[PDB]
Design a protein around this ligand. Sequence first.
Ligand SMILES: [Zn+2]
Lengths: 9, 953
Amino acid sequence: AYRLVDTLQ
Amino acid sequence: NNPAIKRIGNHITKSPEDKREYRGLELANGIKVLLISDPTTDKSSAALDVHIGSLSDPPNIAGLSHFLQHMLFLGTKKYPKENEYSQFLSEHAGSSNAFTSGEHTNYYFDVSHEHLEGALDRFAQFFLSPLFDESAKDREVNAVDSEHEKNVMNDAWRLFQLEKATGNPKHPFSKFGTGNKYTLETRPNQEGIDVRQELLKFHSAYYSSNLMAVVVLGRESLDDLTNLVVKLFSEVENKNVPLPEFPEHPFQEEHLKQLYKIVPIKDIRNLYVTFPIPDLQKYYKSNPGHYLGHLIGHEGPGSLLSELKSKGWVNTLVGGQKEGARGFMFFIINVDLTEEGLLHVEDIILHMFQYIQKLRAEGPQEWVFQELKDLNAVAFRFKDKERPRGYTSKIAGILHYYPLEEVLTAEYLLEEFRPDLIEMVLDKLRPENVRVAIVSKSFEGKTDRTEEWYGTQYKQEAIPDEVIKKWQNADLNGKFKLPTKNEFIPTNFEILPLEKEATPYPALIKDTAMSKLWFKQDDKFFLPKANLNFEFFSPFAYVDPLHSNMAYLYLELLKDSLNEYAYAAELAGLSYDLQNTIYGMYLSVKGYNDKQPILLKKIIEKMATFEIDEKRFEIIKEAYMRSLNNFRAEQPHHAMYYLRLLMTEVAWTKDELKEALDDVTLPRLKAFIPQLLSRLHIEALLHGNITKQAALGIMQMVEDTLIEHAHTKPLLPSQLVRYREVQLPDRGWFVYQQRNEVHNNSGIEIYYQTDMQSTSENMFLELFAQIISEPAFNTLRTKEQLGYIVFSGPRRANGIQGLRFIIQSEKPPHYLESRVEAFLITMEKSIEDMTEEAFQKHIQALAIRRLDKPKKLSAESAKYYGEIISQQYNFDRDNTEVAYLKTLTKEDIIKFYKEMLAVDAPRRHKVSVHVLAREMNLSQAPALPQPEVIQNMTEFKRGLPLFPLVKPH
Ligand SMILES: [Zn+2]
């Protein structure tokens, strides 16, 4: 096949 | 002119299918803006992306920009109430979230279309005068800590941080972005830091208008939206902050030709190969890295993956470019490993370099670029209309990268063939700048390093000069060939005229022993696509744990067998999903209607004539075993899984499936398949750009292919069994307790069972949940800080329903219980005290939520699909249920709570799942009864009645 962030409030 | 506006952009290039209208502009203060007018939209939306993130954290306060992201929701000068923002959204059918990455902090909401200005006014204050209230700060630090806690034992997050820890430690790339209690409170306190002042300073320094991009979508005209955004966002200060840039790659010479041996949490087996590269972002019109990703990551005949799979070394592969930040990027080739592949890592990588050498030998291929371009242009023209909230959030990010006029097209349309760039990137993919990482339990006890933020156990070694040289000498392997022309590329995009007998809902157009066909020709979206959904009913897919195992393995081996062929279809926008269920099998084919009958035919044909390769069977069996074992490393909120097991008539546990798996032999599987296919019932939804006669044709082609090759006959109507939910006794409380062996947090699910689904019961439960939704979050998380994960809502299963709470926490479940109960009493009183108009706002908010129109085909298909698989077939549910909802009073909801939900309720039906951690002005909690502790799930189920099944509409 071709081709991590913190949320929230 | 207008002094508040620096410039209005030219025409924003859009798809001719896109009826939304667009205006780009730049404000005098430097904010880039996109306005989107959609007079049909039920929900309006806005997002703002600040081009600053965790890479800009002070070296001494890790997580600060992320903590700031949480804190902005907790009150501003204009709107000081801690939950003013979230309460306003909830009462007006809205929702919000935000995220922090290395270089961006992105904030978004949606809301009922008539309340855009009110939501946007509150939102704008985030970027003007947040309070960073001292009490808010001390509470909310726990949400961030709990957020990190859940990531700690997650293999993906551990690898993410490990990559950072093994580059140049002086590079901002090495920073820990999440933050926690230690970095955000404890250490700052030890070092005399006033965190509130640090938040105020960071906001002041970096939240500059020149680094911001805003997108607003509403029903208003482009002129009205323009005045709105000028009104609200003109006052953001420009502090002329330079955009951070990172031209020096975090991986320098000494970080290259390195091998890392890593112990995972789950029993997984992977190989990560990475090469440092320049930032290719500026080359978006040619996209050299996507071209190489397409080729290296290909899964068709002649591919890298094909040969590695044939050798029995790897099952899956991902290749291509990966973002870093302004100034650096990575090119990756990652594979999972079979047991044999773990012993042949050196050979796997040689094959990677042989494939790369083949690319170098053939040179750049304009015809490959042309396909890529053609596919991107088709995808752009016929893109599904997006939900406003995700759309505004996405555009706000990319406004920082492309001219206003190109923001919609820039990620799609390719323009320049650039063999110089393709060669340049290809020149970076050499053994002398490779980093290699193997993830395996086999390194357990053999490691000498520990990553500090997550605890990851690893070992770092130089790759031997002799290994490098061997890879440097990779020559051409005759197994590697470029892909051939993709024959699934669609060319017929004709939209068939709407038939005279067309219906607003799916019509039942075939009702036989073998099949039930629901059909709707698309009357809304007018894109050349269709969704073809099939449930195959067979009692033999779930009769016992063994047969459930075989059903699974059968379909996994089938997908594995079709992969090479199906991959071309997938690139060409034609996909399928095939899985075993508790009732048989589910097949979904979606995308461009053109070639769709061809792929479908191939799937059923392969299904019904399937012959298993023994080597693939053994590999996939071993992967499945590990997959079952690995559930042990899932998160404590496990609680959901135990409740499902507890409440459903028939359910096999992961333990029972594990046991039965050794008894799965090849002979047994080969016998199972014809038996599974011998008798079936098929229920289908065919929905999209297709006529009644094409639908009837597709259905009968599926039947005829099964009849022909598998001798399929119809199932008896009585054999079309559905499972029931366990019926809890009036005033009963049951507790099931287990331990999570991996994570050091608790998880809980509390289920207050109400009654069978019906119009009245549905809307009592949904209104109550609407009313308590924001307060539960505010109380249990924001005020009491019980954990990051705090959830409440209706639970629906097997035609029955109730109210659930899900929490993950450091606090013991028995404590969590008393806090949920204390909260429930708060809500009764709160419902008594709320005005009749506040009550009506919640009815209206629920109404808007339920009536929100699907923006795309598959969203409409899924709604009909839910009616079909639940066998309620209530296609007009929304209008009917909302009409009834508008009828409800405060007394109705109070009486409902008092009868079904209150601690002293005569019809309270409560079940709790307590998952214990590995190591195991507050409102007044009521006294609780002694629970009956469930010792055995089978015995629990035996001793209770089973509910009826819901009658079909
Ligand atoms: Zn967060």
